[PDB]
Amino acid sequence: KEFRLGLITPSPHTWTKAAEAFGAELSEKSGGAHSVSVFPARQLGNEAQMLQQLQTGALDMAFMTVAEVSNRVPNMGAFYAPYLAGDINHAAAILRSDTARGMLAVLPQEAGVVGVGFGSAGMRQILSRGAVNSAADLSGLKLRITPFDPILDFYNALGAAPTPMPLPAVYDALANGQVDAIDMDVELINVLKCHEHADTILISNHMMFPMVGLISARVYAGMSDADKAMISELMAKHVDSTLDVYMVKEPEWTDALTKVGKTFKRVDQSFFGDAIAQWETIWADKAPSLPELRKTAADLQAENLYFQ
Ligand SMILES: O=C(O)c1cccc(O)c1
């Protein structure tokens, strides 16, 4: 079978490379019986559209933001608790935990997809066209976000003016003043060159940004038993590989952003004042897995079970 695999990420992005690597290995491991055609850069639609077509089976596979999935399955919102992870290495350990993996079990019924495992992109950061010396400076700023509720809620609690916008429009929106600031990770700040019209780069690491490898449940049900196992295991391997890329490259891409002639500062949880508390109140009755995920995160840190 010729499977199609969609992503919203541009071609240089880690996810896109991982999807191509997965496709190559599936072709080889299947002895040519199967192939994967990868469609990056939103070629097949936006992420919401792609999830709709995974649900029907019109689209076979995706490497998808857990952000979009959370629009369908609000418990996925638990991963976005601010400062749940202290850094990318902590985040990877959380996403590999039994607690996280258990949350995948609901996807076939609730979203019509099989989630094989979690990967990630980098941590979230903030880039602004003006000076930012405290959280008050974010008040009223038109601030680009990924279109999902956890991040909307964080910025609403801070009093910014969050504005959902897909990746391709962001550089132009900054250049032309349609937004004053953006929420984005260091990989894409580098790749999309969004620092060019920014004043200040804030390395806040305020939220993680998981990825999930998805197979349409309708398509999965049509696979042989051997292929269900082989394809899901192979996809899980490639999705998991992204965690190791970010564990290595996050600080490298971050250091690159000290070389673009802008004001560069690192901030921690205290910078955000009461927004973190407000976020917890909003999400307490929306994401029941949150207390267990917090316990898992805390135990991983206490037992030093990742590189730190
Ligand atoms: O900021 C985003 O919307 C985004 C979406 C996908 C991957 C990624 O690194 C970032």
UniProtKB/Swiss-Prot annotation:
GO terms for cellular component: outer membrane-bounded periplasmic space. GO terms for biological process: C4-dicarboxylate transport; transmembrane transport. GO terms for molecular function: carbohydrate binding. InterPro entries: DctP_fam, TRAP_DctP_sf. Keywords: Periplasm, Signal, Transport. Transmembrane segments: none annotated. It is found in: Periplasm. 3-hydroxybenzoate binds at H13, T14, W15, R124, R144, I145, T146, D185. Its main location: periplasm. CDD domains: PBP2_TRAP_Siap_TeaA_like (cd13603). It holds the Pfam family DctP. The complex is comprised of an extracytoplasmic solute-binding protein and a heteromeric permease formed by two transmembrane proteins. Solute-binding protein that binds 3,4-dihydroxybenzoate and 3-hydroxybenzoate (in vitro). Probably part of a tripartite ATP-independent periplasmic (TRAP) transport system that mediates solute transport into the cytoplasm. Belongs to the bacterial solute-binding protein 7 family. NCBIfam families: TRAP_S1. This is Solute-binding protein SPO1773. The gene is dctP.
